Amino acid sequence: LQVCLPKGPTCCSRKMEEKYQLTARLNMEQLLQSASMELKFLIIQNAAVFQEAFEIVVRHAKNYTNAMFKNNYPSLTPQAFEFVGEFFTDVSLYILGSDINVDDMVNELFDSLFPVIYTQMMNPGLDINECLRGARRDLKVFGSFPKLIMTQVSKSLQVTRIFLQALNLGIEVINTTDHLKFSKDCGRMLTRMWYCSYCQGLMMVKPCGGYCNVVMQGCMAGVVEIDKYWREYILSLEELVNDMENVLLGLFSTIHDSIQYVQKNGGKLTTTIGKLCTLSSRRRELIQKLKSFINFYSALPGYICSHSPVAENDTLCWNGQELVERYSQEPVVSQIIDKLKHINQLLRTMS
Amino acid sequence: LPHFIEEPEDAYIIKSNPIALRCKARPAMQIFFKCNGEWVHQNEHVSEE
Numbered sequence A: 001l002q003v004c005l006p007k008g009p010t011c012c013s014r015k016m017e018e019k020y021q022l023t024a025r026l027n028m029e030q031l032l033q034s035a036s037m038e039l040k041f042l043i044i045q046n047a048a049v050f051q052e053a054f055e056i057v058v059r060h061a062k063n064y065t066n067a068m069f070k071n072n073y074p075s076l077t078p079q080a081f082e083f084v085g086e087f088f089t090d091v092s093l094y095i096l097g098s099d100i101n102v103d104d105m106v107n108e109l110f111d112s113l114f115p116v117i118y119t120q121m122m123n124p125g126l127d128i129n130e131c132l133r134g135a136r137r138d139l140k141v142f143g144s145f146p147k148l149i150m151t152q153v154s155k156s157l158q159v160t161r162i163f164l165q166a167l168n169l170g171i172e173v174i175n176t177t178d179h180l181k182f183s184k185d186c187g188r189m190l191t192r193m194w195y196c197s198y199c200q201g202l203m204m205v206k207p208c209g210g211y212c213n214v215v216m217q218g219c220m221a222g223v224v225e226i227d228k229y230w231r232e233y234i235l236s237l238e239e240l241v242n243d244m245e246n247v248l249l250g251l252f253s254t255i256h257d258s259i260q261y262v263q264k265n266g267g268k269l270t271t272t273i274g275k276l277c278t279l280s281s282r283r284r285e286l287i288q289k290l291k292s293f294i295n296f297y298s299a300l301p302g303y304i305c306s307h308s309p310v311a312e313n314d315t316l317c318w319n320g321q322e323l324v325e326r327y328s329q330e331p332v333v334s335q336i337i338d339k340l341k342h343i344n345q346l347l348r349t350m351s
Numbered sequence B: 001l002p003h004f005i006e007e008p009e010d011a012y013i014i015k016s017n018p019i020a021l022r023c024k025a026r027p028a029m030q031i032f033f034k035c036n037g038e039w040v041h042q043n044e045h046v047s048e049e
């Protein structure tokens, strides 16, 4: 045998020892999953809800922009629908983490908007389209409106994108916890603590509380080190929640006023161009519920021992090798800590 | 049995321009569309005899 220390005879062979080792692995994985399930489901629920809520906000804003174009500028439709759809599609793609340039969104929006304004509102009556697109930026026809919208929407969209990425990475690391493979020495120690008593013919004897403590603090020396970074993650997320619904909903007034602004100097513009050519409640409840799990990594060995059958009294218990009267006495973890450091820096820089 | 003369070709929406789908068969008395598993409302259909 290679695990069960044979003091007397033994009722189990080497293959039964391998079976006990695999059952020890499975029991440890089940205990970790039971410890992490509530928090995993909490973060999954909140990620899904916030994603749907942000999509609802974007859809409502696209609908109102299209409706206000239909009502105030029928001469700009159906082209207005095209550039509004492209703008809000790129908005959603940026929110969901795709490489989209916010300044490029606004600039393409105004680049598409100006030629139809010129042809249908200012000078009624396809090849000259690019000359108008160039004149849009070269003559600064929209004034400071494009940069105002650019900063206004970049500020909110970046914080929302990083909020979603933080939720997803919390989901990722909490999923990773219950799949943590341990050392072979820890496998043998868990087999001794949980099952090797059966090899000595004992039926209901439980391991000592102190033996469970030394074993758990033995193989969770790395996992406990995650607690600092997990606490900093929670606190940085709290720093971030303390933005994007109000901004996207005022966009229509700003666009209407920008169109008025361009129409205001039509006299000179036409001649020059003719010559030249409940959310905040949800994130608050989420942070208040997330603060209840700040001790998750520090209380984890305590959980494994308090939910495994152990003799807390340290009397008439199994010490891994014999029944005693009184008890005598990286790589994946490194990746978890790396990702936590990354997300914590990213959080802190936002707020 | 009905033989289709003009079978519907996969359409593509460009710049939010709604493009209708064509269907022509003979001999036919009733022609209906089944978009994504379910029948299309009678009002949406425009028949030509």
Ligand SMILES: *[C@@H]1O[C@H](CO)[C@@H](O)[C@H](O)[C@H]1NC(C)=O
Pocket (backbone or CB within 6 Å): A059, A060, A061, A062, A063, A064, A067
């Ligand atoms: C869609 O447009 C309609 C018509 O103006 C409006 O009543 C509705 O609030 C809009 N919905 C969204 C998702 O914007």
